[PDB]
Amino acid sequence: ASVYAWNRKRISNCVADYSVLYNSASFSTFKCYGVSPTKLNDLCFTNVYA
Amino acid sequence: DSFVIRGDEVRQIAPGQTGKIADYNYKLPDDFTGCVIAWNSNNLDSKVG
Amino acid sequence: SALGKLQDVVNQNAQALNTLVKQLSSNFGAISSVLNDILSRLDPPEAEV
């Protein structure tokens, strides 16, 4: 979607492998703010939104 | 320490960075002191083939 | 209220201990007041801060 109508998707009831996001070189910017990128496999979340 | 990397990977030669060559090629410590030097070498380290 | 002088000292000491225990719940400007949450969420360069 466009940025004025940006698409929000809920992520819930899943086990998430974020290591395929870190190890992929396709992303020009991979920047996390309130959490370390390498600790994402060690934590549990709810209210995940893309 | 001399090496050749890509142009977007020069941000990963730094303390406290997350990245690819930082983890598996060249890691700098958090208490690193010194200077990182980077310059473009497309005229020397590149071939048309 | 005959024994108020001793009870005043007891109440002051217990209230000072309760305030000192309560001060652990404050984050003092950090992201969390729990040390384990910071150590499990962040890399040591920003977890140090």
What layout of secondary structure does this protein have?
The structure is cut from a larger assembly and holds three copies of chain A.
Chain A (H helix, E strand, L loop, with lengths): L9 E2 L7 H4 L25 E2 L1
Antiparallel strand pairs in A: 1-2
Structure, described:
The PDB classes it as viral protein. Keywords: SARS-CoV-2, glycoprotein, fusion protein, viral protein. Cryo-EM structure of the SARS-CoV-2 N501Y mutant spike protein ectodomain. Chains A, B, C: Spike glycoprotein. The organism of A, B, C is Severe acute respiratory syndrome coronavirus 2. This is part of a larger assembly, with three copies of chain A. By secondary structure, the first copy, chain A, is low in regular secondary structure. Chain A has one helix and two strands; from the N terminus they run βαβ. Chain A has one helix spanning 19-22; strands at residues 10-11, 48-49. Chains in contact: A-B, A-C, B-C. The A-C interface holds A 34-36, 38-39, 42-43 and C 31, 40-43.
Keywords:
8% helix; 3 chains; little secondary structure; two-stranded antiparallel sheet; 50 residues; part of a larger assembly; 1 helix; Spike protein S1 (chain A)
Say what oligomer this is.
part of a larger assembly
**Overall geometric form of chain A:** globular
Order of helices and strands of chain A: EHE
Task: Specify the number of helices of chain A.
Answer: 1
Distance between the termini of chain A: 12 Å
How large is the share of residues in beta strands of chain A?
5-15%
Largest sheet of chain A: 2 strands, antiparallel
Give the class of chain A from helix and strand content and strand pairing. Answer: little secondary structure
Helix content of chain A: under 10%
The radius of gyration over CA of chain A amounts to 13 Å
Q: Could you give the count of β-strands of chain A?
A: 2
As laid out across the biggest beta sheet of chain A, the strand order is 1-2
User: What pair of chains forms the biggest interface?
Assistant: A-C, 7 and 5 residues
